[PDB]
Amino acid sequence: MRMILRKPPGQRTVDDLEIIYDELLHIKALSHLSTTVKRELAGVLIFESHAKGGTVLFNQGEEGTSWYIILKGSVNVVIYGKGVVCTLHEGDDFGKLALVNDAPRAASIVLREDNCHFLRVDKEDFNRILRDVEANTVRLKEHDQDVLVLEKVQKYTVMSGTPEKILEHFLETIRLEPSLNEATDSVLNDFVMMHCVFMPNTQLCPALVAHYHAQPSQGTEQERMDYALNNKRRVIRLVLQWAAMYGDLLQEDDVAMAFLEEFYVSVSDDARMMAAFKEQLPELEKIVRQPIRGSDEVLFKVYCIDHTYTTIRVPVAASVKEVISAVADKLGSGEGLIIVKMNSGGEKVVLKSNDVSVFTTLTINGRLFACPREQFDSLTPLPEQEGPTTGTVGTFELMSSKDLAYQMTTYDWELFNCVHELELIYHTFGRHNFKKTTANLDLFLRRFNEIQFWVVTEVCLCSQLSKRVQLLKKFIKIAAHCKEYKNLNSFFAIVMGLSNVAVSRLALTWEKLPSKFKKFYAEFESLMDPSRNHRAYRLTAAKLEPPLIPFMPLLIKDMTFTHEGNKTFIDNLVNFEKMRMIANTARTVRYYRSQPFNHQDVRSYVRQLNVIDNQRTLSQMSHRLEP
Amino acid sequence: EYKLVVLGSGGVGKSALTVQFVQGIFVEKYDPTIEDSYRKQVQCMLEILDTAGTEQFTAMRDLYMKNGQGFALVYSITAQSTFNDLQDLREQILRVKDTDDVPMILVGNKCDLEDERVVGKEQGQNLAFLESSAKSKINVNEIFYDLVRQ
Numbered sequence A: 001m002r003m004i005l006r007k008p009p010g011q012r013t014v015d016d017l018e019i020i021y022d023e024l025l026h027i028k029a030l031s032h033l034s035t036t037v038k039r040e041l042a043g044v045l046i047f048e049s050h051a052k053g054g055t056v057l058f059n060q061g062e063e064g065t066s067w068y069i070i071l072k073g074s075v076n077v078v079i080y081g082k083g084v085v086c087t088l089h090e091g092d093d094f095g096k097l098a099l100v101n102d103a104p105r106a107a108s109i110v111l112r113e114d115n116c117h118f119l120r121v122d123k124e125d126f127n128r129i130l131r132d133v134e135a136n137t138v139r140l141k142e143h144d145q146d147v148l149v150l151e152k153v154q155k156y157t158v159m160s161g162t163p164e165k166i167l168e169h170f171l172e173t174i175r176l177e178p179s180l181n182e183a184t185d186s187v188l189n190d191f192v193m194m195h196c197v198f199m200p201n202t203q204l205c206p207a208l209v210a211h212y213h214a215q216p217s218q219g220t221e222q223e224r225m226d227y228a229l230n231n232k233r234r235v236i237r238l239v240l241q242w243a244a245m246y247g248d249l250l251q252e253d254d255v256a257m258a259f260l261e262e263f264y265v266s267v268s269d270d271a272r273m274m275a276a277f278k279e280q281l282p283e284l285e286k287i288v289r290q291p292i293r294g295s296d297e298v299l300f301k302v303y304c305i306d307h308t309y310t311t312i313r314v315p316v317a318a319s320v321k322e323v324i325s326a327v328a329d330k331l332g333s334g335e336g337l338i339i340v341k342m343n344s345g346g347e348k349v350v351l352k353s354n355d356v357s358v359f360t361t362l363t364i365n366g367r368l369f370a371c372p373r374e375q376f377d378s379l380t381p382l383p384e385q386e387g388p389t390t391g392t393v394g395t396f397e398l399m400s401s402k403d404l405a406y407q408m409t410t411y412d413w414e415l416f417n418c419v420h421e422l423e424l425i426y427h428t429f430g431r432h433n434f435k436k437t438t439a440n441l442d443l444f445l446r447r448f449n450e451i452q453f454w455v456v457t458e459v460c461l462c463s464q465l466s467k468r469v470q471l472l473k474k475f476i477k478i479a480a481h482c483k484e485y486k487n488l489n490s491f492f493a494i495v496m497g498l499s500n501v502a503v504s505r506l507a508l509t510w511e512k513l514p515s516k517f518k519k520f521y522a523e524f525e526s527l528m529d530p531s532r533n534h535r536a537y538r539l540t541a542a543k544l545e546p547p548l549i550p551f552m553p554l555l556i557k558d559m560t561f562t563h564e565g566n567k568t569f570i571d572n573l574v575n576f577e578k579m580r581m582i583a584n585t586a587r588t589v590r591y592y593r594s595q596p597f598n599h600q601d602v603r604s605y606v607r608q609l610n611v612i613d614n615q616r617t618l619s620q621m622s623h624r625l626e627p
Numbered sequence B: 001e002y003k004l005v006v007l008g009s010g011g012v013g014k015s016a017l018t019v020q021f022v023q024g025i026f027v028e029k030y031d032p033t034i035e036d037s038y039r040k041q042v043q044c045m046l047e048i049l050d051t052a053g054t055e056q057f058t059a060m061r062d063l064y065m066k067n068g069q070g071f072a073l074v075y076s077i078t079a080q081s082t083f084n085d086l087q088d089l090r091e092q093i094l095r096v097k098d099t100d101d102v103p104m105i106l107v108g109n110k111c112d113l114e115d116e117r118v119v120g121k122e123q124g125q126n127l128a129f130l131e132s133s134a135k136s137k138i139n140v141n142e143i144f145y146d147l148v149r150q
């Protein structure tokens, strides 16, 4: 029987094959496989025996050349810097992952006891017989607990795991070959972007240092020297991807800056001592409207009930508690203050002590108040919040439809490029969990409402019916030019401004508009159809090439539902499937901004819009234009 | 073909109710970027138009109100302010589509937790009333059943 299984595949007789197959039916690791597959395995499966305990089957870092099943005895799963991570017993299988993913061995396999018997299937035989069929979940275990879970979604991709193991996995699988520069960066991108959710810098940076100084516990001098050197090369590569993702946002993180500065010292010292990192060292040397930073300071007015204000000077990323403290300093008080946002319409929201960087989350005409709780209900809006009482048609009517749309898209692109990718992550998962600003995203999202209410404001302040018809015509044209420039955001903003209750009410204005523009607008309204998950918009945006501004409210929706629709943790492990989905949505934004975009008075107007955002006021103005 | 709308303030549970109806949290991953993300056949087809995550953009809820046929005014029974925000949304519906009567249902979400409840059952009854819970799966399907009947 053992002799039969020791014979080379091409030396096995028909009767040998029949006897082997009968034995394969008792092996539980194969029981989920078909008759067809098990007959093919009968002329491929190799019997392997080793007598000594402590005998090495294979080492961490080596090529995955075999898949194993244990017939008798037990083995230790051994990892550098961790020792025996777990033990596999009779009936268990190992070695699939490296084989299928064409990745290095993530662990060493060492015999636990004397006299162990194995069934082996080598690579080319595994790939033609078992690759698609043997689709068991790969579960890597430490301390009798799952630590990494991988599945066929063709390679096994990470579904869940601990932050440490996920990091270990993505480090080890880095391919340093120059022809794979793009492929390596793409694989790393998910972790590099999403780590702030499950493994903040306070944890990651110490883990990176430890990994950089990790030494192998097996092999000849040269073998150990080579592994450690390539390990270092991999860590540097990850650090480079990590530093590139943050860009200028590193300055906001003292821990990350300290890590990088010390990491550069480490790498440069090692480079000159070992004659290595000749390509990577200079790359690392480089790193060691403008975007608003969290550490930037603002002069912000915080209002009292009697409409007097205190001017505070605090960082953009300051918490509400820090704001309360700053207000209390200048007013010389120690009597329970709360911070409340107030709309132009008198709508009030109490801000929680926990909230950070609230200055940019106000509505267009919103203001910040500080008062004892007893005053909350008695607060009333400021005159400055209620918006203009006279239009500006006499200014922008003299301006070209093309010129206005172009200056809007230019300004919109400056605001859109000010938004860092990580702000989308911070906004979705909650700013307080990161203590980071989303000021650039906040101001860009507010821009959509600014444009919308600009349309409604000018229409509602236009007393003369004839000129009001000229306004509807002009806004429709500005929208058309915006759509041509691929600024879909400002396009939908104008269209929705025309759709506003106060504007759609004006039958006498719409009626007198030429049917050419009636049909143009009706076509724009159909692009807004929420039917089949906004299919009309989604197809429109999909057809377009890179330099484009997407419909931002729908992007915020996608992100919201990705976060709420999916658990961050599954069985106390990071749900990396969720992490990928969020990252994909953020990469969609990156794709939109992958290509650049190709009259001072028009510029000045577009960038200094004064707007009414009080809907009651706008409806009242509408009702007296056309009763 | 039917179109139902979920309305309310943030942190109420609008999105949690939407996902839990169309597919369910945890049992399957939720992809909100595909065609059938908010569509569920129950016999008739229902598209849920949810304002969750877009409350800051009033144009989004208006567009949804325009295309809407059934409406769910949801509040948290652990939040005093959220119950008070429902009056305005009710009025806004009878303005965008310009109608007299509209099929709608009031919903009191998060009914599972009682040691944090600050809003009683009584208040919502005076103004269809349901005390549902998205996470505890209580009355999740029932909310969207009433709207098709109306």
Ligand SMILES: Nc1ncnc2c1nc(SCc1ccc(F)cc1)n2[C@@H]1O[C@@H]2CO[P@](=O)(S)O[C@H]2[C@H]1O
Pocket (backbone or CB within 6 Å): A054, A056, A058, A059, A060, A078, A079, A080, A081, A082, A083, A084, A108, A109, A110, A217, A218
């Ligand atoms: N294939 C392997 N991969 C990694 N580590 C191995 C491996 N094999 C061993 S046992 C070495 C040994 C075998 C027989 C003997 F008589 C004396 C020593 N080890 C040892 O087991 C230790 C487990 O804890 P570490 O701090 S990772 O260091 C490991 C090594 O010293």
Ligand SMILES: Nc1ncnc2c1nc(SCc1ccc(F)cc1)n2[C@@H]1O[C@@H]2CO[P@](=O)(S)O[C@H]2[C@H]1O
Pocket (backbone or CB within 6 Å): A064, A077, A079, A085, A086, A087, A088, A092, A093, A094, A095, A096, A097, A098, A099, A104, A105, A106, A107, A108, A139, A140, A141, A142, A147
């Ligand atoms: N934490 C780990 N890190 C790395 N490797 C682990 C790890 N855990 C394992 S075996 C887990 C297991 C334990 C008991 C059991 F019944 C079923 C599975 N392994 C096995 O050791 C092999 C080392 O080479 P690979 O081709 S990466 O496949 C790995 C797995 O089959």
